[PDB]
Amino acid sequence: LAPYEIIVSEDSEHLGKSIGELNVWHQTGATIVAIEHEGKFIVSPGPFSVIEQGDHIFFVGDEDVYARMKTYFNLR
Amino acid sequence: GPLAPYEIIVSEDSEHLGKSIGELNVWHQTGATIVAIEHEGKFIVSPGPFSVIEQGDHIFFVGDEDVYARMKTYFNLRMGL
Ligand SMILES: Nc1ncnc2c1ncn2[C@@H]1O[C@@H]2COP(=O)(O)O[C@H]3[C@@H](O)[C@H](n4cnc5c(N)ncnc54)O[C@@H]3COP(=O)(O)O[C@H]2[C@H]1O
């Protein structure tokens, strides 16, 4: 149940959007447990939390979900 | 730490049992983000809206102490308090 962490530092059409707007679980299979933004954490973020460039996304899933999240945010 | 999941065993009768996470709309009801369900000793991680919560399952979720209190009340686990 340990979360993966990615840093969304690359340009992506998925930045500047809320978790619900992206519909993250349906896009990547990931359940986001926290967002780190400017060194501050929001746990259990809900659909209205926004993912901005440079933020850290903590999420649960398997290795395939990790791969989907990386590709989805242009981290390849 | 703060991202460590809470664990509740939904052992009491509840109108919410036999429903999917999406039907319950869990995050909007309790503030909790469910990370896994344990059912018959088997774990589903990142369960999504179609996973069903059945009596006796263990629900693992992130939140704070207040979210825990909401989940416990929501699933009829208050033990008379
Ligand atoms: N693991 C879970 N724990 C707690 N509740 C859960 C849940 N999975 C689903 N739900 C609840 O069911 C609703 C629909 O979930 P769905 O995954 O289809 O649709 C979700 C999902 O695609 C996405 N989403 C929201 N929060 C997410 C998160 N932390 N991680 C990944 N995707 C999320 O935005 C959509 C709307 O989310 P919203 O919270 O308004 O509504 C969610 C939520 O109330």
UniProtKB/TrEMBL annotation, chain A:
Highest taxon above the source species: Bacteria
This protein's name: GntR family transcriptional regulator
Residues binding 3',3'-c-di-AMP 2: 23, 26, 32
Residues annotated to bind 3',3'-c-di-AMP 1: 23, 25-26, 32
Gene label: BM110_ORF1201
Lineage: Bacteria, Bacillati, Bacillota, Bacilli, Lactobacillales
Start and end residues of each RCK C-terminal domain: 1-75
